[PDB]
Amino acid sequence: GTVHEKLKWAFNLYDINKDGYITKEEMLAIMKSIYDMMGRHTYPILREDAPAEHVERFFEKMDRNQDGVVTIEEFLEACQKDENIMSSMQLFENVI
Ligand SMILES: [Ca+2]
Ligand SMILES: [Ca+2]
DSSP, rough: OHHHHHHHHHHHHHHHSSSEEEEHHHHHHHHHOOOOOOSSSSSOSSSOOOOSHHHHHHHHHHOOSSSEEEEHHHHHHHHTTTTHHHHHHHOOOOOE
């Protein structure tokens, strides 16, 4: 399956419009969509105590040029730069 093929797969599930640019609105839909059954006991890895907190940090580390939207080029470049972020994105694909 390779790692690169899996990276593009996650982006395809994120970018709803498939324009190569993931926006804040697109991220909100993902957080609401992928959040059904995330465990059976205790799984503290995303303490959502606010609607705007885990999005700013994720976007600040994703958007390279900081144009206001994340792109496939930046996401792929950042995914190979951070292990923590890449681990979280892998959970979304492994959640199904
Ligand atoms: Ca988009
Ligand atoms: Ca960008």
